[PDB]
Amino acid sequence: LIKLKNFTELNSQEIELIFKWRKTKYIDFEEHLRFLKKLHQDSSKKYFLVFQDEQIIGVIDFVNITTKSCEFGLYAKPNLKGVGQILMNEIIKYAFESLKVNTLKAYVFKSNHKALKLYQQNHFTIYDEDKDFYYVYLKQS
Numbered sequence: 681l682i683k684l685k686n687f688t689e690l691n692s693q694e695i696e697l698i699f700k701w702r703k704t705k706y707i708d709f710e711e712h713l714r715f716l717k718k719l720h721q722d723s724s725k726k727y728f729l730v731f732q733d734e735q736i737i738g739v740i741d742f743v744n745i746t747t748k749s750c751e752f753g754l755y756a757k758p759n760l761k762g763v764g765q766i767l768m769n770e771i772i773k774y775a776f777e778s779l780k781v782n783t784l785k786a787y788v789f790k791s792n793h794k795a796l797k798l799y800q801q802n803h804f805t806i807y808d809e810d811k812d813f814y815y816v817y818l819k820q821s
């Protein structure tokens with residue numbers, strides 16, 4: 681039902697679509713392609729387009745991937761609501777089962793209450809804070 685499409689396999693329609701989330705100019709298109717090219721070359725980052733029954737519902741990402749940890753991010757398709765939990769399920773499953781990391785980490789601006797609540801609901805704990813960010817983690821064991 682829920683499937684992950686690696687950014688390394690995106691087609692031009694998908695690239696067009698997702699980078700507009702908030703007449704494509706050549707410089708924007710070219711900058712998106714250069715990003716996708718870096719993803720082909722960098723095993724420490726992985727971005728996925730997430731599908732639910734052949735409909736796009738958001739993007740998830742894992743960066744600073746090591747054998748023990750990673751950072752993650754998520755972004756709901758902007759016309760959809762209530763898909764954060766699905767994206768979070770996928771993030772945790774993929775990190776624990778596919779990357780096999782013990783620690784999942786993120787940081788978010790303190791004003792991002794939607795994201796914080798979602799992380800807290802999935803048993804994340806705030807372990808640090810600076811002027812801009814809260815830093816959260818979840819450990820498998």
Ligand SMILES: CC(=O)SCCNC(=O)CCNC(=O)[C@H](O)C(C)(C)COP(=O)(O)OP(=O)(O)OC[C@H]1O[C@@H](n2cnc3c(N)ncnc32)[C@H](O)[C@@H]1OP(=O)(O)O
Pocket residue numbers: 752753754755756757760761762763764765767788792793794795797798801
């Ligand atoms: C790459 C990155 O940007 S990573 C940083 C995190 N990602 C982002 O900030 C990207 C922009 N934001 C998003 O894509 C979305 O807002 C997401 C994915 C974070 C959340 O999406 P959704 O789950 O669709 O949002 P939704 O409107 O359902 O709200 C999620 C929950 O927070 C709750 N919430 C909303 N506002 C508040 C608030 N002020 N205080 C506490 N909780 C709140 C909702 O009631 C909801 O509760 P539930 O989980 O009990 O149902």
